[PDB]
C-alpha cells in the first residue's frame, strides 16, 4: 500500500515518499494513434479510469499516462507521466509559452520509412526546446533493420544541430528503452515552495442521477499544478470564476473560493500534491456551477494569484513566413502563413490554457485582440498564436503581452 | 342475482330517484327504477320541462339514465308517476352521490354472494336483509349508512365482525371490503432546482436539503433525488393529497427560505402534482 503522509517541508523531485507522479514527460511522434500500444505496454491499459463524461474536445486536449518504472520484489526508481495528444501544433504551442511541458521527450518514430511526418515531428521538437528517439518497426528483416538504423542515424546526424543525439533500436526492447530513459532522465527544477497554481483542463461531477438527499459530492475539477505544492484542506480560488454579461454593460467576472476537500490522482493521492500530473481537486463548489467540462479554461489559485482578468490584450505580433517544418509537395499556397488579417478568430495558448480572440486592429507592431472569454494568465507571458489551416489548428507565430483592459468584479 | 338496494320497496313521494328510460308512449316515458329491483315507472309528458315541449324524444333518449322526482304513488295498482321539472341541480348531485354509494355497497354484497356461491335468490335476499341493511336500520339514514359502515369496517373490523351471518361468510365479506373499500394510492411529485454557486456551495445545498426533508412527518417521507446536476425531484408517496399539497408547499417554502438565507439559488421547476 501507499506510504504517504502529511509531513513535508522541501519536496524532492526524486523522493520516494510520493511515488505517484514526479515529472511530466511527453511522447511526440508520427505514430498516428500508434503510440497507444507502446504506452499501454509500458505502464498499463486502463490504469486511469475514475471519471468519464461526454467528450468535449478530444483532439484539442492533452492526455497524461503515468508510468512507474520499477527495477532492481523490486523497487520503483521513478514514476513519471507520459503525455501525447493528436496534433503536434497544440503541444508545441503549449510548450513554447513558458516551461513545465514534456520534460522528457520520447520519439516513437517508425523505422519503416523516412516520410515528411518524421521531419515535421523533429522540427516541432526542435522548436519546442533532451529527446529520445525509438524505432518501432519490429518484425522485419535483420538487414532491413540495419539499413533503417543507418538511415535513422543519418537523420539524427542531420538533426544534431538542434536535437539529434538519440539511441534506440515483444516488449524486451521496450523494457530496455524504459531502463535507458530512467538512467538518462534528468531531474527538472520545479518550485515546490511558491504559492499554489493550477490550470484546470477537465471539470467533472461524479454525482450520478438519482443521488441521495445529502450525499451530493460535487466540484471535482481536474488539471495540472503549475507552481507550488497543493495541500488538501487549503482554500483554493478560481481565477476565471463566473463571468456574466447580464448587467447590460461590461461583463462581471466574480471569482469562486472553496475549501479543497480532497485531491485525487489516478490512484488515491495524498493530502499534499506534487506538480506534473493530471490531478483532481474536489472542493465545496456547487455541481451546477461546474458541469461536465463546464469549468474548463480556468486557473485555480490559493491566495489570489497575480493573474488578473482581462477583456482585450495587446500582443507583439510576430509570425513565421512559411509553415514551420511543413511544406506540401504541391505547395499551392497551402503552406503559406498569410498575414494577420483583421476580424480573424484564433486561439492564444498560454501554458495549457487556450483562449479565443479576434484581431480587432494591428499595424505591424501590436495587435489589440479582444478575447472570447475573460482570462487571467499573466502580464508578460510569451503568448503563442495559432490558426486553423484546414480542420487542424496550427501555430502561426508568437508574441508578448504588453497591456490591455482588465476587470475585477466583487 | 340482483335485488332492490334498500329493504324499502315503494319509494315515498317528493323523493328524488334514479331511473333508466326504456321506451316512449303517448302518456309519457317508461323507465325502470334501477335501485328498486327495476320496477316499472312513468314520467308524464306534461312534466318533462318547464318550457313548451312538443316531442318526448327531445329529452327522452332511450337507454340514458336520469334523475326524476316522484309526484304520485299508488301501491295498490303498482303505478308510480315521476317528474323532471321539480328536481334542482343540487338535488340531482346528492341523488347521484347516493346512487354511486349504493352501487358500491351492492357491488360489495354481490361479490360476497358470488364468493359464497349462493345460487339461491332467496339466500341473496337474506344476505341483503342481514349483512348490509342492519347498519341501514341502525343509522336511520338509507344509502349513506351502508357506505359509512363499510368504510368503518375497512378501518376497524369490529363492525364487520358484529354481523351475525357466518364465520366463513364474514371472512369473505371482510376480504371483499378490503379489496373494494381500500383503494388508497397516491404519490405526489415535484421538481425544484436548489443550488448555491457561492463559497460553501455543496455544503449549503446539503444543509438546505436536510432542512427541507426534516419537515416530512411520519407516513409522508419526502425523498429528494438528483435527477439532474442542478435540479432535484422531491417525492412524497402519501394519502390525503389535499394535505399532501399543503405539506409540499410548506417544505418548498422552507427550502426557499433556507436557500435565500445563505445567498444561494432556489427555483421552483414545477408545483407538486400526483404521479
UniProtKB/Swiss-Prot annotation, chain A:
What cellular-component terms does GO give this entry? cytoplasm; cytosol; eukaryotic translation initiation factor 2 complex; extracellular exosome
Residues of the region (G1) are: 29-36
Give tissue specificity per the record.
Expressed in testis, brain, liver and muscle.
- EC? 3.6.5.3
Region feature (G3): 84-87
Give the record's keywords alphabetically.
Acetylation, Cytoplasm, Disease variant, Epilepsy, GTP-binding, Hydrolase, Initiation factor, Intellectual disability, Nucleotide-binding, Obesity, Phosphoprotein, Protein biosynthesis
Catalysed conversion reaction: GTP + H2O = GDP + phosphate + H(+)
Give all residue intervals belonging to the tr-type G domain.
20-190
**Example GO biological process term?**
formation of translation preinitiation complex
**Where are the stretches annotated Interacts with CDC123?**
399-410
Record carries keyword Cell cycle? no
Cite the PROSITE patterns for this sequence.
G_TR_2 (PS51722)
Q: Name one GO molecular function term.
A: translation initiation factor activity
* Annotated localization: Cytoplasm, Cytosol
Q: Where does GTP bind?
A: 32-37, 136-139
- Which residue intervals make up region (G2)? 57-61
Using the UniProt annotation, give all residue ranges assigned to the region (G4).
136-139
Question: Function of this protein?
Answer: Member of the eIF2 complex that functions in the early steps of protein synthesis by forming a ternary complex with GTP and initiator tRNA. This complex binds to a 40S ribosomal subunit, followed by mRNA binding to form the 43S pre-initiation complex (43S PIC). Junction of the 60S ribosomal subunit to form the 80S initiation complex is preceded by hydrolysis of the GTP bound to eIF2 and release of an eIF2-GDP binary complex. In order for eIF2 to recycle and catalyze another round of initiation, the GDP bound to eIF2 must exchange with GTP by way of a reaction catalyzed by eIF-2B.
Q: Assembly and partners?
A: Eukaryotic translation initiation factor 2 eIF2 is a heterotrimeric complex composed of an alpha (EIF2S1), a beta (EIF2S2) and a gamma (EIF2S3) chain. eIF2 is member of the 43S pre-initiation complex (43S PIC). Interacts (via C-terminus) with CDC123; the interaction is direct.
Disorder cited: MEHMO syndrome: An X-linked recessive syndrome characterized by intellectual disability, epileptic seizures, hypogonadism and hypogenitalism, microcephaly, and obesity.
What more does the record tell us?
Encoded by an chromosome X-linked gene which escapes inactivation. Does not have any homolog on chromosome Y.
Q: Which family does it belong to?
A: Belongs to the TRAFAC class translation factor GTPase superfamily. Classic translation factor GTPase family. EIF2G subfamily.
Q: What is this protein called?
A: Eukaryotic translation initiation factor 2 subunit 3
Its gene is EIF2S3
Swiss-Prot record, chain B:
Q: How is its activity regulated?
A: Activity is regulated by phosphorylation at Ser-46 and Ser-49, which stabilizes the eIF2/GDP/eIF2B complex and prevents the eIF2B-mediated exchange of GDP for GTP, thereby preventing the formation of the 43S pre-initiation complex (43S PIC). This results in the global attenuation of 5' cap-dependent protein synthesis and concomitant translation of ISR-specific mRNAs that contain a short upstream open reading frame (uORF) in their 5' UTR, such as ATF4, ATF5, DDIT3/CHOP and PPP1R15A/GADD34.
From the UniProt record, give one GO term of the biological process aspect: stress granule assembly
Entry-annotated residues carrying N6-acetyllysine: 138
- Pfam families per the record? EIF_2_alpha (PF07541), S1 (PF00575)
Q: Which UniProt keywords apply?
A: Acetylation, Cytoplasm, Initiation factor, Mitochondrion, Phosphoprotein, Protein biosynthesis, RNA-binding, Translation regulation
| Induction per the UniProt record | Up-regulated upon endoplasmic reticulum stress.
Q: Which PROSITE patterns match?
A: S1 (PS50126)
Where does it primarily localize? Answer: cytoplasm
Q: Which GO terms describe its cellular component?
A: cytoplasmic stress granule; cytosol; eukaryotic 48S preinitiation complex; eukaryotic translation initiation factor 2 complex; extracellular exosome; glial limiting end-foot; membrane; mitochondrion
What residues bear Phosphoserine in this entry? 46, 49, 155
Quaternary structure and partners: Eukaryotic translation initiation factor 2 eIF2 is a heterotrimeric complex composed of an alpha (EIF2S1), a beta (EIF2S2) and a gamma (EIF2S3) chain. eIF2 is member of the 43S pre-initiation complex (43S PIC). eIF2 forms a complex with at least CELF1/CUGBP1, CALR, CALR3, EIF2S1, EIF2S2, HSP90B1 and HSPA5. Interaction with METAP2 protects EIF2S1 from inhibitory phosphorylation. Interacts with ABCF1 isoform 2. Associates with ribosomes. Interacts with DDX3X in an RNA-independent manner. Interacts with CDC123. (Microbial infection) Interacts with rotavirus A non-structural protein 2; this interaction probably plays a role in the sequestration of IF2A in viral factories. Interacts with rotavirus A non-structural protein 5; this interaction probably plays a role in its sequestration in viral factories.
Describe the function of this protein.
Answer: Member of the eIF2 complex that functions in the early steps of protein synthesis by forming a ternary complex with GTP and initiator tRNA. This complex binds to a 40S ribosomal subunit, followed by mRNA binding to form a 43S pre-initiation complex (43S PIC). Junction of the 60S ribosomal subunit to form the 80S initiation complex is preceded by hydrolysis of the GTP bound to eIF2 and release of an eIF2-GDP binary complex. In order for eIF2 to recycle and catalyze another round of initiation, the GDP bound to eIF2 must exchange with GTP by way of a reaction catalyzed by eIF2B.
Protein's name in the database: Eukaryotic translation initiation factor 2 subunit 1
Task: State the organism named in the record.
Answer: Homo sapiens (Human)
Amino acid at each position: 500500500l501507499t506510504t504517504l503522509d502529511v509531513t513535508k517541508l522541501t519536496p524532492l523531485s526524486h523522493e520516494v515518499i510520493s511515488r505517484q507522479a514526479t515529472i511530466n514527460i511527453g511522447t511526440i511522434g508520427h505514430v498516428a494513434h500508434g503510440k497507444s500500444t507502446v504506452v499501454k505496454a509500458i505502464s498499463g491499459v486502463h490504469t486511469v479510469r475514475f471519471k468519464n463524461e461526454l467528450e468535449r474536445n478530444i483532439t484539442i486536449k492533452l492526455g497524461y499516462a503515468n508510468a512507474k518504472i520499477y527495477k532492481l520484489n523490486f523497487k520503483l526508481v521513478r514514476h513519471v507521466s507520459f503525455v501525447d495528444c493528436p496534433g503536434h501544433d497544440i503541444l508545441m504551442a503549449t510548450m513554447l509559452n513558458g516551461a513545465a511541458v514534456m520534460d522528457a521527450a520520447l520519439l516513437l518514430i517508425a523505422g519503416n520509412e523516412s516520410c515528411p511526418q518524421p521531419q515535421t515531428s523533429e522540427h516541432l521538437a526542435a522548436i519546442e526546446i533532451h529527446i529520445l528517439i525509438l524505432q518501432n518497426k519490429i518484425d522485419l528483416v535483420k538487414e532491413s533493420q540495419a539499413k533503417e538504423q543507418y538511415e535513422q542515424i543519418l537523420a539524427f546526424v542531420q538533426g544534431t544541430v538542434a536535437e539529434g543525439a538519440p539511441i534506440i533500436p515483444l516488449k524486451y526492447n521496450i523494457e530496455v528503452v524504459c531502463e535507458y530513459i530512467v538512467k538518462k532522465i534528468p531531474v527538472p527544477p520545479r518550485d515546490f515552495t511558491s504559492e499554489p497554481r493550477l490550470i484546470v483542463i477537465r471539470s467533472f461531477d461524479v454525482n450520478k442521477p438519482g443521488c441521495e438527499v445529502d450525499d451530493l459530492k460535487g466540484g471535482v475539477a481536474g488539471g495540472s499544478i503549475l507552481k507550488g505544492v497543493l495541500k488538501v484542506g487549503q482554500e483554493i480560488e478560481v481565477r476565471p470564476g463566473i463571468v456574466s454579461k447580464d448587467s447590460e454593460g461590461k461583463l462581471m467576472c466574480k471569482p469562486i473560493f472553496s475549501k479543497i476537500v480532497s485531491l485525487f490522482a489516478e490512484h488515491n493521492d495524498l493530502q499534499y500534491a506534487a506538480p506534473g500530473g493530471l490531478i483532481g481537486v474536489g472542493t465545496k463548489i456547487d455541481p451546477t456551477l461546474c458541469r461536465a467540462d463546464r469549468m474548463v479554461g480556468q486557473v485555480l489559485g490559493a491566495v489570489g494569484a497575480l493573474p488578473e482578468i482581462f477583456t482585450e490584450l495587446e500582443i507583439s505580433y510576430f509570425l513565421l513566413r512559411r509553415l514551420l517544418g511543413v511544406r506540401t509537395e504541391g505547395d499551392k499556397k497551402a503552406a503559406k502563413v498569410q498575414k494577420l488579417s483583421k476580424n480573424e478568430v484564433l486561439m492564444v495558448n498560454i501554458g495549457s490554457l487556450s483562449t479565443g480572440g479576434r484581431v480587432s486592429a494591428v499595424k505591424a507592431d501590436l495587435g489589440k485582440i479582444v478575447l472570447t472569454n475573460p482570462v487571467c494568465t499573466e502580464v508578460g507571458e510569451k503568448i503563442a498564436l495559432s490558426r486553423r489551416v484546414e480542420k487542424h489548428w496550427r501555430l502561426i507565430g508568437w508574441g508578448q503581452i504588453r497591456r490591455g483592459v482588465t476587470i475585477k468584479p466583487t | 342475482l340482483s335485488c332492490r338496494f334498500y329493504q324499502h320497496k315503494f319509494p315515498e313521494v317528493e323523493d328524488v330517484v334514479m331511473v333508466n328510460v326504456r321506451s316512449i308512449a303517448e302518456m309519457g316515458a317508461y323507465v325502470s327504477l334501477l335501485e328498486y329491483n327495476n320496477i316499472e315507472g312513468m314520467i308524464l309528458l306534461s312534466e318533462l320541462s318547464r318550457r313548451r315541449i312538443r316531442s318526448i324524444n327531445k329529452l327522452i333518449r332511450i337507454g340514458r339514465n336520469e334523475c326524476v322526482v316522484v309526484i304520485r304513488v299508488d301501491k295498490e295498482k303498482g303505478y308510480i308517476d315521476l317528474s323532471k321539472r321539480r328536481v334542482s341541480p343540487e338535488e340531482a348531485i346528492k341523488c347521484e352521490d347516493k346512487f354511486t354509494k349504493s352501487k358500491t355497497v351492492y357491488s360489495i354484497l354481490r361479490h360476497v354472494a358470488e364468493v359464497l356461491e349462493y345460487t339461491k335468490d332467496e339466500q341473496l335476499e337474506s344476505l341483503f336483509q342481514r349483512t348490509a341493511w342492519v347498519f341501514d336500520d341502525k343509522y336511520k339514514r338509507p344509502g349513506y349508512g351502508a357506505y359509512d359502515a363499510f368504510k368503518h369496517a375497512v378501518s376497524d373490523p369490529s363492525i364487520l365482525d358484529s354481523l351475525d351471518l357466518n364465520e366463513d361468510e364474514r371472512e369473505v365479506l371482510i376480504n371483499n371490503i378490503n379489496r373494494r373499500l381500500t383503494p388508497q394510492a397516491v404519490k405526489i411529485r415535484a421538481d425544484i432546482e436548489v443550488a448555491c454557486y457561492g463559497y460553501e456551495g455543496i455544503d449549503a445545498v446539503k444543509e438546505a436539503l436536510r432542512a427541507g426533508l426534516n419537515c416530512s412527518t411520519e407516513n409522508m417521507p419526502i425523498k429528494i433525488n438528483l435527477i439532474a446536476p442542478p435540479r432535484y425531484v422531491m417525492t412524497t408517496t402519501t394519502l390525503e393529497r389535499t394535505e399532501g399539497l399543503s405539506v409540499l408547499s410548506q417544505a418548498m417554502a422552507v427550502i426557499k427560505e433556507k436557500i435565500e438565507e445563505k445567498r444561494g439559488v432556489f427555483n421552483v421547476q414545477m408545483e407538486p402534482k400526483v404521479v
